[PDB]
C-alpha cells in the first residue's frame, strides 16, 4: 500500500534524532537538544499527514473550462 514509505522515513528521522541526542553541543545543552529534536518531529509529522490521504483518494478534480491542449 506504500504506507511503508511513511514507515521508512519515520525510521530514518527517528534514527537521526537519536544520533543527535548523543551529539548536541555542551554549551546550551537542553536548548539545542530540545529545539532540534522537537522540530524534526513536527516537520516530519506534517509531511507524513500530507503524503497520506493523497495515497488513496476518494475525490477527483473537475476543472470544467480547461483549454484542449
Amino acid at each position: 500500500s506504500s504506507f511503508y514509505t511513511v514507515v521508512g522515513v519515520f525510521i530514518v528521522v527517528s534514527a537521526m534524532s537519536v544520533l543527535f541526542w548523543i551529539m548536541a553541543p555542551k554549551n546550551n545543552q537542553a536548548v539545542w537538544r530540545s529545539t532540534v529534536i522537537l522540530t524534526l518531529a513536527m516537520m516530519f509529522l506534517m509531511w507524513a499527514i500530507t503524503f497520506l490521504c493523497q495515497l488513496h483518494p476518494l475525490v477527483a478534480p473537475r476543472r470544467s473550462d480547461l483549454r484542449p491542449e
Binding site: 545543552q29 537542553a30 536548548v31
Partner: protein, 143 residues
C-alpha cells in the same frame, strides 16, 4: 560550572548575613553591586513608622522631592537636561565602585536645602513682573 536551568528552575539557597553595624552601610553597596540576592522581609508585623532607619528615609526623600521640584522648574524655561552618558563607571566589569561616604551625602542634603529657597524666591520675583506685564499689555490693547 553553572547549571543551565532552562528545563527546570535553578536550585536556591537561603543565606543568613551577620553584618556588623559599623560596616553595614558599606556592605549593602557590595551586596547591591552584585545583583543576585533577593532579601525577604524579617521585620514583618512592625508598622512603617516604627521601623529602624526612618529618618534616613525622610531626609533622603526630602532631597528627592527637592530634585523633583527642580526638574519641574527645568521644563519651564526650556533647558535640556545633560544626561551624562557614562552609565558605565557604576555598571560594567570590575563590579566594584567605592560608594560616596557620609560627608558627600550631607553635602547633597545641605546643597539642595540651600538651593531650594533661593530658587523659590528667584521664581517668585520674576512672576510679580509677569502679572503686571499682563494688565499693562491688555490695557495697551484697550487704548
Amino acid at each position: 560550572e553553572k547549571e543551565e536551568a532552562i528545563f527546570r528552575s535553578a536550585e536556591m539557597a537561603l543565606v543568613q548575613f551577620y553584618i556588623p553595624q559599623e560596616i553595614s552601610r558599606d556592605s549593602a553597596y557590595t551586596l547591591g553591586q552584585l545583583g543576585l540576592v533577593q532579601f525577604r522581609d524579617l521585620n514583618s508585623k512592625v508598622r512603617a513608622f516604627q521601623r529602624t532607619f526612618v529618618n534616613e528615609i525622610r531626609r533622603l526623600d526630602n532631597v528627592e522631592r527637592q530634585y523633583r521640584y527642580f526638574y519641574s522648574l527645568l521644563k519651564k524655561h526650556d533647558i535640556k537636561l545633560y544626561e551624562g552618558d557614562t552609565d558605565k563607571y557604576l555598571d560594567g566589569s570590575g563590579e566594584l565602585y567605592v560608594p560616596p561616604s557620609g560627608s558627600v551625602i550631607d553635602d547633597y542634603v545641605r546643597n539642595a536645602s540651600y538651593l531650594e529657597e533661593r530658587l523659590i524666591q528667584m521664581e517668585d520675583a520674576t512672576d510679580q513682573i509677569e502679572v503686571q506685564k499682563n494688565d499693562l499689555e491688555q490695557y495697551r490693547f484697550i487704548l
